[PDB]
Amino acid sequence: LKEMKKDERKAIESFINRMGFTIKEGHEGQSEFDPDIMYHFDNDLYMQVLDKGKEPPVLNKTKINVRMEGFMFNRERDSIYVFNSLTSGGFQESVFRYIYKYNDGDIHFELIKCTTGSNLDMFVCEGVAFPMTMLGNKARVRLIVPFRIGPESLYSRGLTGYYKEVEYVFRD
Amino acid sequence: VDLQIHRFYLSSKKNPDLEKVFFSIDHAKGTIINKKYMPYGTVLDSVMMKLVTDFSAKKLRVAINDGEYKDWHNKDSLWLRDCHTLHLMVFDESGEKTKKYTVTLNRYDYQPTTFVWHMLDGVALPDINASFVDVVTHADKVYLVAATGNKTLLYSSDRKNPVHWTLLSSSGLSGACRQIAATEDGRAWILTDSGIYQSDDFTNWSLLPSEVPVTTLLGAMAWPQGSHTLALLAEKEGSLFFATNIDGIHSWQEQAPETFPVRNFSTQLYKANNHPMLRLVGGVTHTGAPATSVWITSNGNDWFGLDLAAGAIPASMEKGALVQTPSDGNLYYYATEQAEGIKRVAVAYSTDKGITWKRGAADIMLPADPFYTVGYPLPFVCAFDDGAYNIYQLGGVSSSGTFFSSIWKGILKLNEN
């Protein structure tokens, strides 16, 4: 298992310097985000807020739909899975309720399963729902989610997700 | 583990159709029966019997008709050209355990679509000169409508005994009968040159008020409880549109396709899925060419055609005749086909309640009337059903001038008894 952690550390290090990225440190409750700096948030999550958004969500009340575009990579092989909902059509939005519950770790979402066609419910994880603790409605972010807070289905394979752009909009 | 048969079938090197035949196996009585009859005229010269059995099955013995039990092997092509019963005996490796099976081959000894026909004696059909003639059966009464030039005549007779025909005194009617329609409760409509006329007794006719000049009366329904939907085809601008006349109220609907008939078509009203439905067969297109499609509908707003075979429906330039036998639910359509320069009668039959239609052989289905061997001088075909395995085929000769004279009654042979 520790080998998977080491391989993920190597993959993250080789990916961050592959394109121009400025890694900084982030503290909880941060409010001011440089629109050109990627932050490290102590939960191994990497965030670069392209737009802060609007009014913050209400806990255990707001239901949010997300549209994400990006791909997943490994230490040596990339583009194992590619997903897109912001540009290509034919994909139902993914809906989650904003909650807080410590079942095993920090869980900030309750997914509402979509039963009306093809979607990306298996690409919604803790890393995707985390930026809602700070940002607001109509929010656009870029994320690098390690396997620990990645999708639960793709946990054994130890894949690292890179979300090129995730957009959050309130309501169903 | 013991001795049983789970699947059994026949296959021929020269005949591949034996594989599709399915056999049902009853262990309680030990009988193998093909419940679907094998097609007439088949040949069973050399055939292999392929059967799926248990592993414990070791020895098999086959007896043909009343022959001898012969030790059977999987590589035997047996001879059963004239064989209708077969006996099978299965043994295990021990040899003492036995089980008997009887296989009976079901085949049509004659043509499955043969008909038997008879003259009706004493018939007194009126000698009437008319262009459009139709027959409508309600309860236990047949009514024949004829468009004699500019006028309209109606005659009545008994469904069971159509021997005697009586003229009816029509009151309120005017113009020439273009088309007729009727529901199951006896109410009838006739479209003439003037507006539509309505009656409940085929005698007293009231002019239905309207403004849009209708072009054809397709049919009538009684779907809204207490009302009477009336499907119509009218002319708007320079195209044809479907229309409804539900309780006098007029409405416009979808645009008719270009292959939709306007004249000399046969209509019928039936029921499916707890809903009245209309079926329309044959006719002449708006351009003038004949139409060879079947159109059904449920509300009169729009119609759609079925996916038939390669020209199963005969192409006719004049009125056909659509009849139904309700006891077996069979549909028949008689039309006039211009085959090799001669007007003959062609029959299209259906047994799947109108789902599928197949062209039939005229010489077997139709009567053997000598006067119609060389052609069909009359410009229309009339036929009405009876209610149980009985059809009437008005017309033996051309009579004194025009119109039919004699009546033919026919029964499907399969349902003779």
């Binding site: 059509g89 039963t115 009306t116 | 499916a272 707890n274």
Partner: protein
């Protein structure tokens, strides 16, 4: 170590200590009333027509609008521009009726704006002012194998216009209003004729299939999709007809039809509340209702029916029926006023609720007034309705909980046994009568 209820104490008990138990029988009054327009947020729609002998008719169709992606700019410039086909796919998962009845589906193009509302409508007369026929095709529900789709070719003009607007024209695929007013309008999907089936359509797509980039010196088909989602506004036209015989008085049964249709309303009078609790003249007693069972037995459905009973029923007051679905709540979020039955199982054919005493407590609590000479009394009747709902579950197998509760959008019908003939509208309210004089 001994646990037996000693009876010794009681001869020196204070006069205001002792308690007691009581039972009161309460009567419902049962009616069947039109359900009304239903709130529907999901993407499910119904397409087709149905006729049932004991339940009347239903005609369902809809109007849809496609979801516009931002900066569409689809790949692989089509060879010399242009495209090949614009086939539109209607996807359905299940149906009600006969899987072999032939229907005729027509696709029109409208030029109006879809009204903002999530309620199913009837008589959409204003929208269909001009319209324009695009396509029409016959189909049947069950097509063998598992190809549960309806594929309808469309004219190439709409796909060509979409492609043109994405390259040589401004990228207007930004706001939904701009996409609806410039790129593509609203599509009206209906069945012009035929009867016997209703499809539960869950989405509809419009695949624009183009040639490809030249691909060295070959070419290989590629395509777009343009699905519709629940973020936009649809129009569901659900119309139930000839159900007037279900609304007439019949004192042994009450019907609940699902798509709009009819529902069962239960009314407890005010006097029945007044001379069963509070009341009296001492004004020192009080009631604490602790048990009130309520179970309903569904009548055995007759053979030949096309509609089957709904799996779940929701019992809730009629006043809280709007805000229950507009806020997308769940029976676990209002445990005091909304109750969910159990699975309709053909072994016993009954919907079993449980102790509803909290509902009666809630009704008594905030509807008790006093006449000028004391005499507390109830001022309003208790009105409840039974609705057919669709429940979506989640959680582990041992712990299953109601994740989502929506209004049921599929043809169904049930005849419950509630009336005066066999005393089926009876509840036995078990209460505790203590005394309390600290006022």
């Amino acid at each position: 170590c001994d646990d037996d209820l000693s009876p010794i104490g009681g001869s020196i008990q204070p006069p205001s200590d002792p308690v007691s138990a009581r039972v009161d029988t309460l009567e419902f009054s049962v009616k069947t009333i039109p359900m009304g327009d239903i709130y529907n947020r999901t993407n499910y729609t119904l397409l087709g027509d149905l006729t049932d002998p004991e339940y009347g008719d239903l005609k369902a169709d809809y109007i849809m609008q496609f979801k516009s992606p931002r900066n569409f700019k689809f790949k692989y410039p089509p060879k010399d521009g242009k495209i090949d086909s614009v086939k539109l796919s209607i996807n359905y998962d299940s149906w009600a009726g006969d899987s072999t009845s032939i229907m005729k589906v027509s696709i029109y193009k409208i030029n109006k704006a879809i009204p903002p509302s999530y309620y199913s409508t009837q008589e959409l007369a204003s929208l269909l002012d001009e319209t324009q026929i695009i396509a029409s095709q016959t189909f049947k529900a069950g097509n063998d194998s598992a190809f549960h789709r309806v594929r309808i070719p469309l004219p190439n003009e709409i796909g060509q216009k979409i492609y043109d607007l994405s390259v040589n024209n401004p990228s207007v695929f930004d706001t939904q209003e701009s996409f609806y007013n410039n790129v593509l309008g609203g599509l009206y999907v209906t069945t012009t004729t035929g009867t016997g089936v209703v499809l539960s359509v869950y989405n509809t797509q419009m695949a624009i299939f183009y040639s490809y980039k030249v691909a060295a010196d070959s070419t290989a088909t590629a395509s777009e999709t343009f699905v519709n989602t629940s973020e936009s506004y649809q129009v569901n036209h659900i119309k139930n007809s000839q159900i007037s015989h279900l609304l007439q008085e019949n004192d042994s049964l009450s019907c609940v039809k699902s798509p709009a249709g009819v529902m069962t309303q239960l009314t407890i009078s005010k006097e029945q509340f007044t001379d069963a609790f509070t009341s009296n003249l001492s004004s020192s007693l009080a009631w604490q209702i602790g048990e009130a069972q309520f179970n309903i037995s569904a009548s055995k459905p007759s053979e030949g029916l096309m509609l089957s009973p709904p799996s779940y029923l929701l019992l809730l007051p009629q006043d809280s029926v709007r805000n229950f679905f507009e806020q997308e709540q769940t029976e676990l979020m209002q445990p005091r006023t909304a109750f969910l039955s159990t699975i309709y199982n053909i072994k016993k054919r009954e919907y079993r609720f449980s102790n509803i005493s909290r509902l009666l407590m809630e009704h008594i609590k905030n509807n008790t007034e006093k006449t000028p000479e004391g005499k507390p009394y109830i001022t309003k009747d208790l009105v409840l309705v039974l609705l057919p709902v669709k429940r979506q579950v989640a959680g582990a197998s041992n712990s299953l909980y109601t994740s989502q509760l929506n209004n049921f959008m599929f043809p169904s019908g049930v005849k419950l046994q509630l009336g005066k003939k066999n005393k089926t509208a009876r509840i036995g309210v078990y209460s505790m009568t203590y005394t309390d004089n600290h006022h």
